[PDB]
């Protein structure tokens, strides 16, 4: 399932703050439901402090509109290129700007 509520998310933040970065079984040994891989997925998806999960701008959108036309797929390829780096916020921006261009 992986509902990933905030009470486990802040514990995972404290566990990354104390132990380390490539140290995952020792911090997944204290969550009662999750393994190392799903914690890796959320921490490289939502809990890294370099993730710009808000403040959508103008320059990155006009960058990605003729970058999602170079390749229609491969959103995780262009995720270090944009700098948004969440790899799912780009999909939300793409479908939202295509809903706004159709309406």
């Amino acid at each position: 399932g992986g509902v990933w509520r905030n009470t486990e998310d802040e514990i995972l933040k404290a566990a990354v703050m104390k132990y380390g970065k490539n140290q995952w079984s020792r911090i997944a040994s204290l969550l009662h439901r999750k393994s190392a891989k799903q914690c890796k997925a959320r921490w490289y998806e939502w809990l890294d402090p370099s993730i710009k999960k808000t403040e959508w701008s103008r320059e990155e959108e006009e960058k990605l509109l003729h970058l999602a036309k170079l390749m229609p797929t491969q959103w995780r390829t262009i995720a270090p290129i944009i700098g948004r780096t969440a790899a799912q916020c780009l999909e939300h921006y793409e479908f939202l700007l295509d809903k706004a261009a159709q309406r």
Binding site: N6, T7, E10
Partner: protein
């Protein structure tokens, strides 16, 4: 069990307290207590 003292609120486990740092911000409502402590900024 855990307790926030200015909050006067209970928390059953650890993550119940350490997610209570963003909601019902009385930590900015201690500005009135700081103004009572010192009349100037």
């Amino acid at each position: 069990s855990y307790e926030c003292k200015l909050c006067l609120t209970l928390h059953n486990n650890e993550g119940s307290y350490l997610a209570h740092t963003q909601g019902k911000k009385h930590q900015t409502n201690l500005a009135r207590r700081a103004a009572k402590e010192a009349k100037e900024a």
